[PDB]
From a paper:
Human NAD-dependent isocitrate dehydrogenase or [name] (HsIDH3) catalyzes the decarboxylation of isocitrate into α-ketoglutarate in the tricarboxylic acid cycle. It consists of three types of subunits (α, β, and γ) and exists and functions as the (αβαγ)2 heterooctamer. HsIDH3 is regulated allosterically and/or competitively by numerous metabolites including CIT, ADP, ATP, and NADH. In this work, we report the crystal structures of the αβ and αγ heterodimers and the (αβαγ)2 heterooctamer containing an α-Q139A mutation in the clasp domain, which renders all the heterodimers and the heterooctamer constitutively active in the absence of activators.
Crystals of the apo αMβ belong to space group C21, and the asymmetry unit contains eight αMβ heterodimers, which form four (αMβ)2 heterotetramers through noncrystallographic 2-fold axes. In the apo αMβ structure, the conformations of the β3B-α3B and β12B-α8B loops are similar to those in the WT αβ heterodimer. In the αβ, αMβ, and αMMgβADP structures, the active site assumes an “open” conformation due to the absence of substrate and/or cofactor. However, in all of the αMβ structures, the hydrogen-bonding network at the αβ-αβ interface is similar to that in the αMgγMg+CIT structure or the αMγ structures, indicative of active conformations. In the αMβ structures, the α-Q139A mutation eliminates the Gln139A1-Gln139A2 hydrogen bond. The intramolecular hydrogen bonds His131A1-Gln139A1 and His131A2-Gln139A2 are replaced by the intermolecular hydrogen bonds His131A1-His142B2 and His131A2-His142B1, and in addition, His142B1 and His142B2 form extra hydrogen bonds with Glu150B1 and Glu150B2. The changes of hydrogen-bonding interactions at the αβ-αβ interface induce conformational changes of the β5-β6 loops, which lead the sidechains of Tyr126A and Tyr137B to adopt the active conformations as well. The results show that in the absence of activators, both αMβ and αMγ heterodimers exhibit significantly higher Vmax and lower S0.5,ICT compared to those of the WT αβ and αγ heterodimers. In contrast to the WT αβ and αγ heterodimers, both of which exist as heterodimers (75 kDa) at low concentration and a dimer of heterodimers or heterotetramer [(αβ)2 and (αγ)2] (130 kDa) at high concentration, the mutant heterodimers exhibit an average molecular mass of approximately 131 to 149 kDa at both low and high concentrations, corresponding to a heterotetramer [(αMβ)2 and (αMγ)2].
Residue numbers in the entry:
A (entry chain D), D (entry chain C): 14 to 52, 62 to 81, 92 to 351
B (entry chain A): 3 to 337
C (entry chain B): 2 to 47, 51 to 337
The structure:
């Protein structure tokens, strides 16, 4: 088989993971999940050293502690319409590429005086170059034709200027990819107005968070949008919109479309291409036919109702 | 009696649309006198740029200003126009009310959102340090006085414009100390304004919800960078910056109401500009002055002029000119 | 007029012997002092100093503190930090004077180092920017600087001192040290009965070693005072004969001995009370008991110039009791 | 042969470089000064890229910028008693080694709030591991026995502990050298009671500023202690105590001893050992016989007179 470390996490996490494995069982997916029951920590890294691939729920910070030990510097969110699920921006196809290790996210805060707080935002040449080349490496491997660098360099002239600088440099080594630059607040206005003008977007940490959840809203929300985070060695597959109330639903309510699609994108990375496409097609058909929809997509169906429908339709493609 | 407002027509289409507001304001019998001023920075002592004195003196006297788009300065040492004004007048609250226009179709129809952005600190502190080569630290600055001040105005805004709820938007989960203090000062003011409903949400949650369903939101108040962004997002829901009013409230009763769109130098001179943005900003100003009845008429008589759609400008998906659009509004503000 | 209770913190090692010695010298001098022993050794709360020790300092505003113990837990914070944050100790004060009994290469030293004790480089704020890149935050504020300079010119007036030098590095740290210089100037132009000057840290260090005659009262930010004070201590004999007081808010003030706890000679009668005693002298002058202070001081100095009875650390074989009771003899003049 | 870059500097600098030239002339030294009257002027990197050595006087700000363009990271100050000059500490032989590109010296200051100034002190592994290897390589090349790391790591636990951490690791690569640590303020007090306990001292920038001048005072003053700064490629020879009023008052009263001594140290670096020891011991003997002394040494002779005497005995064949 294929060993993959599974961090179920909290909330619907353990339930969404139960969906991945009921759908993997139904599809005879040659994958053995090695389940790290709770979120000391280094056993996940030693397991990641041999397995190299993980699939996680949700859980500096605890989850951005994990991302440092595994060097998950690059986050990728595929923002793609699902044909059956109608929103205000259908037939849209963007990828968000977010840097995940620098910025505000390292709790470099202090009190310089009573009632005066400083938060440091860190931008280095090292990680800007690494995420800029990643973005162009992404655009060529996957055959996208444009990389837009989002920033606020007209106000933070250093720092955000240094991100833009790197981005513009790497942009020169990739002549067949088009390279534009856009200011963060203008870009957010364009996403609600004409999201179709973008292809790949590369940005730093906080803008990523903003655009991640913004664009996931375009295409149906936190229930359907997959993400993945890379290092140089490791690939870890999660959901795309990672805000705090992403799927704060009770038992048997949540939509497993996000995790399942990202599960199928893991299978591709494992080179199990037949299975990756079988599970992707099932999900997309079940959604398009419209018989079974979770509450977040309109329908009245539970999460079990929905994923066992996936199971039926995918044991059939294995006719 | 009749009040004097300092007029700053700006550059490019600015004159044309400022002229258009002056004529619309005249048809409304609105008790408004205009005092033209020019804010283009001059080189003061030692070369340190500054707002002209007649520009400052006239704002400190009349308190209210109406200001159109301004050109981007080309000199490199030249500081931001927005920064000069903000510092010269202590403009601490930026206000962007976004309301779906009945006749201008976008994917969103039920939008009515007022973003109140803190306008003086946060990540726009202007403090950066090159720590070592290739490593930069940008200082985000949150203080209790500024966060208290911005929260007091959001509640002031909601009280004076009959607004139901106020939401503090933040990332206290990521920036516990800074955003927490902002969220704390919001909470404290929130307890002395129990007649306005108050709640908190995360910025990332607010953006994903903002685009699935904008009706769920009302008055929003947040730190600087978050407002600079959310306000443009929300403006993207109603048709862009050309239909979007802006206010900047400051110290000593000073408020400057502006258009957030650009100079449009290619269509200057032509009768092609659209004044809706500046005009709507002028009715923001009226309501700020307590001229609610006059504001309600000019507002309602421009919404009408767009609803029937007989003569929109080039940008609004129409073929008419600046004269006709203006003239329709004048006609209807008389009945 | 009237008896005062002073919190006594005898401390560890040679602590309780030398503070017992001071107690009896104060007794022999009929000085208006009662004592109230307490223990500042910090304890794990919900680390903190015990509340009975805090209530005693709150009531009796004066403490006399012997040498404390270096805690062993790594998570245990600086015993000086707890005492400083508890009572807001903002001025650390080290009067260094050549002892004429105790020969040193430096014979005409009389310097007072008033050190700012709350901010500076010792702000306790540091960040890891990235792997192997640390930033330490030095804080200089307007209020702290004014407060330290206001003490310094007060100390100079009350202790009949002629000059006050602000020592800084404002050619390097032009904003932080600049503000400190800016407020010392403001206070100076309000106390124009004191000749006030400024000097660079590195100039002062070069001149101190060559001629300490030229210095008087030195006010300076935290780290500079931490270093400049130990440097001047070495001018006159070391931590074993230097007084020290930490002035705080709410009338609080803790005079300490800065030498170590000397556990190898604990129990035996070999400790040198000179340092803890000359701080007790500082406490009296701070309290206003100038006549009891000069008396006890003159007793101690005369006991050292005679040389008949010196502890092992000043070049004698006398026991600690032989040394103290001789002092007790002299102060009954 | 041998071109050497000379930057006379400000203050009494030019009159000391005049003294250097006259003693070199007296000694018939094969060294031609290509000098630059500084105070961009990348001219000096242009010149040092060929000459590789310089003699400089008193000069982020210009000095720290120059050091940055020359990567003059390591500073070496020689604290050695001169046999005729009597102080409170004689027969002393210390070497002060100081990091010079980091700490509080890059003008990283700002205002958090009216009356609240922040100032960042930068310590990095890279530059601490480098100044640490240099101190131990200095001890090996020069037969020294002990390297003492001076810090304030009990207060600034991160940062000075970083500097400490890097010293301790480098110290393990040099088992033949002994390694001690001492706390800056203790060290200063020890330097007045008993500086003899020290061999070689290594420290970061600001403590280096402090101990440079303090130790200079032990053995004579700013007019007799020479110093050098090194790169990987460059060697610059200056004076040891370079505090703001070092020799800044006067004209024809300055002491040329400090400059002359590091001038001879420079000749030693160019492998002109014959002229290096000739000049050195001329100066040491003029000081010992005590005929002419400048005012900092309890004499009444001018800079010219003192230099006229050094010259007179460089040329005196019955040495």
């Amino acid at each position: 088989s294929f060993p993959v470390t599974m961090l179920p996490g909290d909330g619907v996490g353990p339930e969404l993971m139960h969906a991945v494995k009921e759908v993997f069982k139904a599809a005879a997916v040659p994958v053995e999940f090695q389940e790290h029951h709770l979120s000391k920590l280094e056993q996940v890294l030693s397991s990641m050293k041999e397995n190299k691939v993980a699939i996680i729920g949700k859980i500096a910070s605890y989850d951005m502690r994990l991302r440092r030990k595994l060097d998950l510097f690059a986050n990728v969110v595929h923002v793609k319409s699902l044909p059956g699920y109608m929103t205000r921006h259908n037939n849209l196809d963007l990828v968000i590429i977010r840097e995940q290790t620098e910025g505000e996210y390292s709790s470099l805060e202090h009190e310089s005086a009573r009632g005066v707080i400083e938060c440091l935002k860190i931008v280095t040449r090292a990680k800007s170059q690494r995420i800029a080349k990643f973005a162009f490496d992404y655009a060529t491997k996957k055959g996208r034709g444009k990389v837009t660098a989002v920033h606020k360099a007209n106000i933070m002239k250093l720092g955000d200027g240094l991100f833009l600088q790197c981005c513009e440099e790497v942009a020169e080594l990739y002549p067949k990819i088009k390279f534009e630059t856009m200011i963060i607040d203008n870009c957010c206005m364009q996403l609600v107005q004409n999201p179709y003008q973008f292809d790949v977007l590369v940005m730093p940490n906080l803008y990523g968070n903003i655009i991640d959840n913004l664009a996931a809203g375009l295409v149906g929300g936190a229930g359907v949008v997959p993400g993945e985070s890379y290092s140089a060695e490791y690939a870890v597959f999660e959901t795309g919109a990672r805000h705090p109330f992403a799927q704060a639903v009770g038992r048997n309510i949540a939509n497993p479309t996000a995790m399942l699609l990202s599960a199928s994108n893991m299978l591709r990375h494992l080179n199990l291409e037949y299975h990756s496409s079988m599970i992707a097609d099932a999900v997309k058909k079940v959604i398009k036919v419209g018989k079974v929809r979770t509450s977040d997509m309109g329908g009245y169906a539970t999460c079990h109702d929905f994923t066992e429908e996936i199971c039926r339709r995918v044991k059939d493609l294995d006719e | 009696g009749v009040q004097t407002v300092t007029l700053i027509p700006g550059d490019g289409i600015g004159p044309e649309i400022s002229a258009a507001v002056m004529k619309i304001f005249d048809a409304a019998k609105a008790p408004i006198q205009w005092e033209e001023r020019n804010v283009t920075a001059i080189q003061g002592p030692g070369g340190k740029w500054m707002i002209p004195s007649e520009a400052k003196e006239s704002m400190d006297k009349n308190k209210m200003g109406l200001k159109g788009p301004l050109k981007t300065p080309i000199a490199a040492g030249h500081p931001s126009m927005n920064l000069l004004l903000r510092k010269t007048f202590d403009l601490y609250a930026n206000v962007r009310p976004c309301v779906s226009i009945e006749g201008y179709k976008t994917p969103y129809t039920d939008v009515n959102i007022v973003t109140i952005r803190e306008n003086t600190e946060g990540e726009y502190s202007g403090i950066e340090h090159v720590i070592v080569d290739g490593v930069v630290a940008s200082i985000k600055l949150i203080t209790e006085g500024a966060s208290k001040r911005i929260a007091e105005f959001a509640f002031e805004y909601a009280r004076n414009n009959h607004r139901s709820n106020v939401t503090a938007v933040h990332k206290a989960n990521i920036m516990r100390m800074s955003d927490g203090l902002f969220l704390q000062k919001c909470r404290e003011v929130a307890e002395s304004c129990k007649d306005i409903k108050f709640n908190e949400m995360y910025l990332d949650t607010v953006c994903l919800n903002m685009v699935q369903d904008p009706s769920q939101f009302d008055v929003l108040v947040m730190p600087n960078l978050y407002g600079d962004i959310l306000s443009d997002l929300c403006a993207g829901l109603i048709g862009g910056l050309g239909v979007t009013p802006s206010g900047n409230i400051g110290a000593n009763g000073v408020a400057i109401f502006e258009s957030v769109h650009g100079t449009a130098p290619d269509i200057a001179g032509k009768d092609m500009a659209n004044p809706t943005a500046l005009l709507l900003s002028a009715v923001m100003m009226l309501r700020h002055m307590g001229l609610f009845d006059h504001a309600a008429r000019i507002e309602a008589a421009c919404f009408a002029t767009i609803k029937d759609g007989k003569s929109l400008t080039k940008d609004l998906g129409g073929n008419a000119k600046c004269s006709d659009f203006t003239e329709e509004i004048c006609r209807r503000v008389k009945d």
